[PDB]
Amino acid sequence: TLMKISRGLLKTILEAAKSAHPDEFIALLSGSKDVMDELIFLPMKVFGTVHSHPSPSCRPSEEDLSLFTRFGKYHIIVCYPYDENSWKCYNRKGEEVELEVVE
Ligand SMILES: [Zn+2]
């Protein structure tokens, strides 16, 4: 039904963002059916993208708006301090999307 993201994937994303800090982390999202459970690193179906911001804001940047139009329908933004409440998901049009974590 409605797309959800696995807890493990979320955790790996937050850890990768923290490790990239102060630089931005960027990667592709994927999975099977209705669960995001694949992380694809940059040098198959693509659900979307994920990238971080070294500051406390998850608001899409001008560039992000351009990124959202190319890879998948779900685009996650993770921001400092990269805890479980520092990310948001957006769709190709930059609108906010509700992405629940699997039990
Ligand atoms: Zn950005």
Side-chain angles (χ1 to χ4, degrees):
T1 300
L2 291 171
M3 184 64 82
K4 291 185 172 186
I5 181 168
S6 73
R7 260 273 160 39
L9 181 52
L10 215 202
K11 170 180 181 180
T12 298
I13 289 182
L14 295 184
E15 310 187 320
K18 285 184 178 173
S19 298
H21 188 79
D23 300 309
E24 303 194 309
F25 157 68
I26 184 168
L28 298 179
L29 292 167
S30 191
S32 76
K33 298 183 179 182
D34 311 307
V35 178
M36 275 184 231
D37 53 359
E38 304 186 60
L39 198 50
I40 304 176
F41 287 76
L42 310 182
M44 300 190 70
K45 298 181 180 60
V46 176
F47 287 3
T49 71
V50 62
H51 87 299
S52 57
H53 289 168
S55 52
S57 133
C58 267
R59 290 298 84 189
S61 68
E62 300 181 300
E63 299 181 300
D64 296 330
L65 303 177
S66 180
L67 177 66
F68 297 179
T69 61
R70 298 187 177 183
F71 299 75
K73 301 177 176 179
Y74 305 77
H75 305 277
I76 292 170
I77 297 194
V78 180
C79 60
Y80 186 97
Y82 319 103
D83 53 39
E84 303 178 359
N85 299 311
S86 306
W87 65 280
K88 285 183 182 177
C89 186
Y90 302 90
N91 57 28
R92 292 182 179 180
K93 298 184 180 65
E95 299 155 44
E96 206 153 309
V97 170
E98 189 74 356
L99 179 59
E100 295 182 65
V101 186
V102 179
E103 300 180 0

